[PDB]
Amino acid sequence: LHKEPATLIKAIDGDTVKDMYKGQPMTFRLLLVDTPEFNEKYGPEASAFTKKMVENAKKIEVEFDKGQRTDKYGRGLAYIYADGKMVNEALVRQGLAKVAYVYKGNNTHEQLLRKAEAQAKKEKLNIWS
Ligand SMILES: Cc1cn([C@H]2C[C@H](OP(=O)(O)O)[C@@H](COP(=O)(O)O)O2)c(=O)[nH]c1=O
Ligand SMILES: [Ca+2]
DSSP states (O other), rough: OEEEEEEEEEETTTTTEEEETTTTEEEETTTTTEEHHHHHHHHHHHHHHHHHHHOOOOOOOOEEEEEBBTTTOOOOOEEEEEEEHHHHHHHHTTTTTTOOOOOOOTTTTTTHHHHHHHHHHHHTTGGGG
């Protein structure tokens, strides 16, 4: 896998962000996670966490996996990095997302994320509280 450049257009919610990628706007859905909807418990906290992480970064990157790059809604499927730190992993490590939507052949970072989930659970953080 490799990181590619993008620029934030707009944080959307805990697991979606609108970035410009190769000069075109697109909405990215974070691989391998599920944050609560805004209307749900922890949903606002997830949205706020992702927003601050992407808005504060000097450098946003996208990393596609080995399989599907868009989902059925035309959303990009990627791991997103903010100054080198993976947003997907950070959300899981803080108990603000579950590991979810693990489809075969776009699951390169599954075990990293699962390791983070286990530690969030041990710490009884947020969703695990
Ligand atoms: C994360 C992810 C979601 N999806 C689709 C599955 C779900 O379809 P359904 O909408 O039919 O439930 C939907 C969940 O995304 P959200 O959690 O953003 O709603 O996105 C993928 O197809 N591939 C992915 O890697
Ligand atoms: Ca969601």
